[PDB]
Amino acid sequence: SGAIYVGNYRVVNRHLATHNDWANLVWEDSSRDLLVSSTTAQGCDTIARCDCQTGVYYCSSRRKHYPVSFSKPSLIFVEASEYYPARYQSHLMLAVGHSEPGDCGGILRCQHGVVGIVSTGGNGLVGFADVRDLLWLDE
Ligand SMILES: COc1cccc(SC(C)C)c1NC(=O)N1CCC[C@H](C(N)=O)C1
Numbered sequence: 001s002g003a004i005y006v007g008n009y010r011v012v013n014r015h016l017a018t019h020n021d022w023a024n025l026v027w028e029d030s031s032r033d034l035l036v037s038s039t040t041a042q043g044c045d046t047i048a049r050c051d052c053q054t055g056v057y058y059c060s061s062r063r064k065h066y067p068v069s070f071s072k073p074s075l076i077f078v079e080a081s082e083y084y085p086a087r088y089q090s091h092l093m094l095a096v097g098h099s100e101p102g103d104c105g106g107i108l109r110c111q112h113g114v115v116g117i118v119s120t121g122g123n124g125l126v127g128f129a130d131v132r133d134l135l136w137l138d139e
């Protein structure tokens with residue numbers, strides 16, 4: 001679990017969005033596994049606007065942060081789950097690092113701010129949904 005709170009927006013994994021997220025929907029994209037809902041309170045986070053390919057992510061299944069080198073946002077095949085059919089997920093960045101089901105939503109940060117959130121994983125891999133191209137989050 002986990003979310004980004006920036007301005008009057010809450011960014012979550014689309015597959016973990018709540019009834020309240022859908023009732024206050026701003027934007028969603030199943031191909032990216034992202035959903036953004038509106039909030040009444042001002043957020044605590046800021047978003048990176050950069051091309052960093054290294055950073056640090058929070059891994060809830062270890063209660064720890066780990067450093068990672070990750071690929072540029074791209075279209076990657078993701079196997080069927082209870083949440084989605086087999087498909088290509090876009091704007092996804094892969095890295096070597098621990099992740100399990102439950103780790104989705106953990107934040108990836110570089111020196112410039114929030115880069116994205118955990119969205120997929122596998123046998124020693126962790127994948128992140130990028131948010132750096134969503135310029136409207138800042139206004
Ligand atoms: C952090 O997520 C994981 C980590 C290790 C393993 C796993 S599936 C295990 C059966 C190999 C997963 N789960 C996932 O990759 N997803 C299930 C939830 C939806 C995700 C999506 N964006 O489509 C895909």
Ligand SMILES: [Zn+2]
Pocket residue numbers: 048049050051052110111112113
């Ligand atoms: Zn950066």
